[PDB]
Amino acid sequence: MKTIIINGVQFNTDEDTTILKFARDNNIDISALCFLNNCNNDINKCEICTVEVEGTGLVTACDTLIEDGMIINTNSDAVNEKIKSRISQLLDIHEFKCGPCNRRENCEFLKLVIKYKARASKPFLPKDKTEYVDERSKSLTVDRTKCLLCGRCVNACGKNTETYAMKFLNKNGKTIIGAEDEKCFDDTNCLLCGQCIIACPVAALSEKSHMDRVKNALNAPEKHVIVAMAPSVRASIGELFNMGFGVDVTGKIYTALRQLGFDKIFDINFGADMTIMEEATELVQRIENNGPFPMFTSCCPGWVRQAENYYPELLNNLSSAKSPQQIFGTASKTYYPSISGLDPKNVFTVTVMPCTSKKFEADRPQMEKDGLRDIDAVITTRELAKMIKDAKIPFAKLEDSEADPAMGEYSGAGAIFGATGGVMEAALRSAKDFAENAELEDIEYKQVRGLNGIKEAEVEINNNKYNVAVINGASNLFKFMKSGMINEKQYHFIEVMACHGGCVNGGGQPHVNPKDLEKVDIKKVRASVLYNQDEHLSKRKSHENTALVKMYQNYFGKPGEGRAHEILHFKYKK
Numbered sequence: 304m305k306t307i308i309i310n311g312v313q314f315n316t317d318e319d320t321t322i323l324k325f326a327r328d329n330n331i332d333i334s335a336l337c338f339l340n341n342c343n344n345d346i347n348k349c350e351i352c353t354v355e356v357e358g359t360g361l362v363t364a365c366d367t368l369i370e371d372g373m374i375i376n377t378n379s380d381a382v383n384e385k386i387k388s389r390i391s392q393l394l395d396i397h398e399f400k401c402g403p404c405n406r407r408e409n410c411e412f413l414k415l416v417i418k419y420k421a422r423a424s425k426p427f428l429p430k431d432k433t434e435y436v437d438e439r440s441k442s443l444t445v446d447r448t449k450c451l452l453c454g455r456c457v458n459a460c461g462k463n464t465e466t467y468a469m470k471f472l473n474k475n476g477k478t479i480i481g482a483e484d485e486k487c488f489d490d491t492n493c494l495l496c497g498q499c500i501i502a503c504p505v506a507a508l509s510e511k512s513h514m515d516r517v518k519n520a521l522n523a524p525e526k527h528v529i530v531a532m533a534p535s536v537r538a539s540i541g542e543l544f545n546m547g548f549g550v551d552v553t554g555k556i557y558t559a560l561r562q563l564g565f566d567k568i569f570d571i572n573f574g575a576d577m578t579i580m581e582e583a584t585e586l587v588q589r590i591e592n593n594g595p596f597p598m599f600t601s602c603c604p605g606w607v608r609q610a611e612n613y614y615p616e617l618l619n620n621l622s623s624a625k626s627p628q629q630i631f632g633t634a635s636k637t638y639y640p641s642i643s644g645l646d647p648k649n650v651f652t653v654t655v656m657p658c659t660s661k662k663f664e665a666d667r668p669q670m671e672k673d674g675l676r677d678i679d680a681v682i683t684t685r686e687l688a689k690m691i692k693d694a695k696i697p698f699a700k701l702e703d704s705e706a707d708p709a710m711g712e713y714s715g716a717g718a719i720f721g722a723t724g725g726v727m728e729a730a731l732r733s734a735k736d737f738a739e740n741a742e743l744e745d746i747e748y749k750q751v752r753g754l755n756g757i758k759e760a761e762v763e764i765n766n767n768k769y770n771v772a773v774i775n776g777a778s779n780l781f782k783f784m785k786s787g788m789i790n791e792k793q794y795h796f797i798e799v800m801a802c803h804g805g806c807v808n809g810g811g812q813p814h815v816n817p818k819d820l821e822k823v824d825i826k827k828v829r830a831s832v833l834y835n836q837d838e839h840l841s842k843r844k845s846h847e848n849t850a851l852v853k854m855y856q857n858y859f860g861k862p863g864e865g866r867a868h869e870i871l872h873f874k875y876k877k
C-alpha cells in the first residue's frame with residue numbers, strides 16, 4: 304500500500320495513477336486545463352495543474368504519478384503563484400468579452416479567472432480581428448483571439464477520428480491551430496464532425512451559425528417556416544437549462560418551438576422512418592444476389608466525407624437513401640406543400656441537429672430540386688438553446704405539447720437513431736419484415752448496441768445467415784479497414800457513425816464541464832432517453848408509422864421505386 308499526504312491530509316492507496324486523477328476521485332481541487340482525453344499538451348504544457356512535491360519541486364499533476372511517501376502542496380503559496388503567472392500569459396492573448404461570448408455561461412477559463420483572481424498584465428485588444436477569424440467553412444468557425452492553444456482540439460481530433468485534420472501550424476514564426484496548410488477545413492480531409500469544438504474550453508472553436516437564416520425566415524412575411532429536431536436533441540438540450548442528464552424533454556421542445564414563432568413543428572425521426580423505408584428495401588434488393596456487398600449507411604455526413612476522402616471505392620456501396628435530414632427536407636418541399644396548399648417556394652425548412660457536419664450536408668450544391676433546397680438551415684442544439692434563452696421562454700417550467708402529425712409522428716425504430724447501433728437495429732426491424740413478408744415480434748438487436756468500438760452480429764433472414772457490423776466512431780472505421788477485419792467474412796450491411804457513442808456525442812452538442820464529465824457517462828445517459836422512448840412506444844417499426852404510410856400511399860408510392868427512387872435518394876460519385 305502507498306501512503307500519500309496531500310496538504311496535511313493522509314490517504315492510503317494502492318492504485319498507480321496521477322496526482323490529478325487521485326485528487327479528482329477524492330474531492331480535492333487541483334485545477335486542470337490542457338489535460339483532456341487522457342493526454343496533455345505534450346509540447347508546451349499549460350501547468351494550471353502544478354503541484355509541489357517535497358524536495359523535487361513544482362511538477363505538473365496531470366501526468367505526475369503518485370509515489371509512496373509523498374507530501375503534496377496544491378493550494379500552496381509558491382504553487383498558486385506559478386499558476387497565476389501562467390494564467391496571466393494566456394489572459395493576455397484573450398479578451399474579456401464574456402457578454403456577448405457564446406461560452407460565458409459554461410466557459411472554463413472564466414471560472415479560473417474569478418477563482419485565481421487572474422489579471423491581465425496588458426489587455427489584449429486587437430484592432431482588427433480578421434487575421435484571427437476563419438468563417439469560410441460551412442460547419443466550423445475559428446476565432447483565434449479566444450484561443451489559448453492548449454492542444455485539446457488537436458488531441459481530440461487524433462483520438463476520435465485519427466484523420467489529424469486539426470493541426471498545429473506555423474504562421475509567421477508563431478503557432479496557431481487550423482487545417483492543413485491553413486486551408487478552409489472543408490477543403491481538407493476534415494470530416495466536419497465537430498469533436499474539436501467539444502474539446503475546446505473557450506469560444507475559439509465554434510459552429511458556423513445558421514440562426515440569422517432562421518430569424519430572417521421567421522420575420523419574412525411570405526415564408527412558412529418548418530422546424531424539425533434530430534433524435535439526440537430531446538435527450539440533451541435540457542442539460543443547458545440545468546435540468547440534469549438523461550432528461551427527456553421532447554414535449555417541452557415542441558412548445559418552445561411554437562413560442563419562437565415556427566409555423567409547423569415536425570420531427571427528423573419521421574425522416575428517420577423514411578430513411579429506413581428506403582434503405583431496408585435496398586438491403587433486401589441487395590440480398591437478391593449481390594447488391595453489391597457490403598451496403599454501408601449514408602446518414603452520417605462525417606462518415607460520408609471520410610469515405611469521399613479516404614475510401615472513394617466505397618462510395619458506390621453506400622446506400623442510395625438520403626439521410627433523415629435530407630429525406631425529410633425533400634418531402635418538405637414536395638409532399639408537405641401538397642397537403643396545406645402552399646407554394647414550395649415559400650416553405651423554409653429548419654432542422655435542429657447535434658451536428659456541425661449536417662450544415663455542410665444541407666448546404667451541398669445538389670441537395671435541391673428545381674432551385675428549392677432540401678434543408679434551408681440547420682441550427683445545432685446549442686443554437687436552439689440560445690434562441691429559447693434570448694426569447695426568455697422558461698424551458699423547464701413549460702407545458703408539454705405534441706408535434707403536428709403529418710411529418711412529426713415517429714416509431715421506436717426512428718427514435719434510437721441518435722445512438723450507435725441505432726440505425727442498424729431500426730433497419731433490421733424493417734429488413735427482416737420485408738424479406739420474410741411477416742410481422743415479426745422479435746425486434747431487439749441488443750448485440751449491435753452499446754459503446755464498444757467495433758460490434759458485429761450474425762442476423763438470420765429467410766433462414767439464411769447475414770453478417771452486419773457497427774462502427775462506432777471514425778477512428779474505428781480506420782481500424783476496421785486497415786486491419787483487414789472487413790475481409791474476415793462477407794459483410795452484408797455496415798453502419799458507420801463518425802462520433803463515438805453516435806449522434807448523442809455529436810459536434811453540435813452541449814459542452815459538459817470536466818467535473819461532470821468524470822462522474823457521468825454522457826454517451827450512455829443521453830442514449831438511454833432514446834431507447835426508453837423505443838420501449839414505451841407502441842409502434843417500434845418504421846414501416847408501421849401511420850403518418851409515414853399515408854405519405855407513401857398518397858404521394859411517393861412504394862419504397863425504392865418510381866417516385867421514391869427518383870427524388871428521395873442521393874449517390875456520391877466523388
Ligand code: HC1
Nearest residue numbers: 533535575602627628658721806
Ligand atoms: O446529427 C445527427 Fe443524427 O445517424 C442524430 O441525432 S442519427 Fe440522423 O441517420 C440524420 O439525419 C437521424 O434521424 S445522423 C440525426 O439527425
Ligand code: SF4
Nearest residue numbers: 400404407410505506
Ligand atoms: S472564451 Fe471564456 S473567458 Fe474568453 S471571452 Fe469567452 S466567456 Fe470570456
Ligand code: SF4
Nearest residue numbers: 451452453454456503
Ligand atoms: S481552438 Fe480551443 S481546444 Fe484548440 S488549442 Fe485553441 S483553445 Fe485549445
Ligand code: SF4
Nearest residue numbers: 460493494496497499
Ligand atoms: S471537425 Fe472532426 S475531423 Fe475536422 S478537425 Fe474537428 S475533430 Fe478533426
Ligand code: SF4
Nearest residue numbers: 603605658802806809
Ligand atoms: S455521428 Fe451524428 S453528430 Fe457525429 S458526424 Fe455523424 S451525423 Fe454528425
Ligand code: FES
Nearest residue numbers: 336337348350365
Ligand atoms: S493540465 Fe497539466 S500541464 Fe496542462
